[PDB]
Design a protein around this ligand. Sequence first.
Ligand SMILES: *[C@@H]1O[C@H](CO)[C@@H](O[C@@H]2O[C@H](CO)[C@@H](O[C@@H]3O[C@H](CO[C@H]4O[C@H](CO)[C@@H](O)[C@H](O)[C@@H]4O)[C@@H](O)[C@H](O[C@H]4O[C@H](CO)[C@@H](O)[C@H](O)[C@@H]4O)[C@@H]3O)[C@H](O)[C@H]2NC(C)=O)[C@H](O)[C@H]1NC(C)=O
Ligand SMILES: *[C@@H]1O[C@H](CO[C@@H]2O[C@@H](C)[C@@H](O)[C@@H](O)[C@@H]2O)[C@@H](O[C@@H]2O[C@H](CO)[C@@H](O)[C@H](O)[C@H]2NC(C)=O)[C@H](O)[C@H]1NC(C)=O
Ligand SMILES: *[C@@H]1O[C@H](CO)[C@@H](O[C@@H]2O[C@H](CO)[C@@H](O)[C@H](O)[C@H]2NC(C)=O)[C@H](O)[C@H]1NC(C)=O
Ligand SMILES: [Zn+2]
Ligand SMILES: [Zn+2]
Length: 412
Amino acid sequence: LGRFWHISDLHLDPNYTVSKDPLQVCPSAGSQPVLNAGPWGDYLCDSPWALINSSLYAMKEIEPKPDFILWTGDDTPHVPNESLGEAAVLAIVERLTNLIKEVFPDTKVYAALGNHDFHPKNQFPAQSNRIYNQVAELWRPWLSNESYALFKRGAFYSEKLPGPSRAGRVVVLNTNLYYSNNEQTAGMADPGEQFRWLGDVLSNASRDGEMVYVIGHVPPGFFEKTQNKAWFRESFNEEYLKVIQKHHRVIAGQFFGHHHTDSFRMFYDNTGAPINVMFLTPGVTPWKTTLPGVVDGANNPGIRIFEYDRATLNLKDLVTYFLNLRQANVQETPRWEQEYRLTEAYQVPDASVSSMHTALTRIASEPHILQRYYVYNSVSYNHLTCEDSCRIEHVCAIQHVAFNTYATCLHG
Ligand SMILES: *[C@@H]1O[C@H](CO)[C@@H](O[C@@H]2O[C@H](CO)[C@@H](O[C@@H]3O[C@H](CO[C@H]4O[C@H](CO)[C@@H](O)[C@H](O)[C@@H]4O)[C@@H](O)[C@H](O[C@H]4O[C@H](CO)[C@@H](O)[C@H](O)[C@@H]4O)[C@@H]3O)[C@H](O)[C@H]2NC(C)=O)[C@H](O)[C@H]1NC(C)=O
Ligand SMILES: *[C@@H]1O[C@H](CO[C@@H]2O[C@@H](C)[C@@H](O)[C@@H](O)[C@@H]2O)[C@@H](O[C@@H]2O[C@H](CO)[C@@H](O)[C@H](O)[C@H]2NC(C)=O)[C@H](O)[C@H]1NC(C)=O
Ligand SMILES: *[C@@H]1O[C@H](CO)[C@@H](O[C@@H]2O[C@H](CO)[C@@H](O)[C@H](O)[C@H]2NC(C)=O)[C@H](O)[C@H]1NC(C)=O
Ligand SMILES: [Zn+2]
Ligand SMILES: [Zn+2]
């Protein structure tokens, strides 16, 4: 049994300050007054350094010798572009990179850029640029020569897992190329040729007897905290689905972030068979989202470990840990705790596709399992009851990555 951490959406707010002025605590809160801010963060703000530092040392306490770490990006705060230029973006990515290197000096890390890890935000080019070049330098100890060259061109690459994993590979995507707010890739069918490359990597994996973990920042499909919100342009969503449908037999897991909330996505083939699952890990940042229509969309800080079979990459379990921010802020030191173990929460034997399908069916049919999933969705921040419209928004997002079937499901 191996273990790996998955962390995402740290979103440092460099200017977080415990201030007597509620409008000068954190620029990431915008114009929202931040009353009696605490040292470990605030639900209206992105993460203070103290919180990010606490999260890394919590990971070290829980599992100091993981087989590897997956890090799916989003390092900078939710502020206007004019507040956050290229030098600051790169300095922030470097500071977080250095913290991970300091706390886990002997650990391989597979890192993807998130949509905020660029200036201007979301405008990821399908070609080389100063940010891809400098991040390749920061992540060079983690990249093969081939991956270093690929990263400079498109911020995507693939790496063979080291032993004792028998025959595994991690594929790291730049899914920021597909975000509808990214004007750099408007009108491009296959920006950076990433889909062509991905298919080729996965065909090679089948030839070579390897199983693959696919990671990225922005997921396909819809955001479960609202209705009708997809990040990918429709054509990219369709292409991503086509890749999974063709190559699922070599894909042992998909690991994404961006939402900051804890959910998962099922993939099915045209016979109705479940063929893959994507795990959307929560964020370290607690920041209450400004996405229109989302009420009280904050979360507790979360981190996650997966347990896996080193011989096959089959996922055996996951454990999500959290910091109860409201409690931590009245205490001298933040102490992270176990939120849940997946097999226990859903009463399933492992984290296989069949087990996740069972989890969904229970979420969709048993009130107490729906509510359990819902509480965990915000990392145990919000305990109000998930009522009928909440249920449909979550169930449809989990079940339907495709635009048209998601739309039909929402009619329920
Ligand atoms: C699916 O699987 C296939 C294998 O079946 C992969 O194909 C291999 O891809 C690699 C990577 O591109 C190829 O290796 C590269 O070969 C280049 C050419 O090498 C010859 O020719 C040059 C000039 O003619 C000579 O200089 C050289 O000595 C050889 O005679 C090299 O230029 C490449 O160098 C790269 O890596 C090193 C660092 O390790 C750097 O020094 C270079 O700057 C450069 O970064 C590299 O060695 C290999 O030839 C391919 N094999 C076959 C059989 O085709 C596919 O890539 C894979 N598909 C995907 C999508 O992953
Ligand atoms: C955070 O505040 C900085 C300004 O802080 C000063 O510069 C830092 C480098 C550091 O030395 C602090 O102690 C200083 O008080 C903002 O940076 C400025 O932003 C304005 C635009 O509003 C721009 O005109 C200035 O040139 C910027 N200064 C520098 C040095 O770049 C920064 O935008 C704030 N960060 C966030 C994320 O909101
Ligand atoms: C980052 O977090 C670590 C872990 O909590 C902090 O290190 C602790 O610091 C206290 C006070 O100096 C010591 O009593 C502990 O022994 C330290 N623990 C470890 C494991 O080193 C560290 O101070 C934090 N750094 C920042 C910049 O906040
Ligand atoms: Zn994020
Ligand atoms: Zn994001």
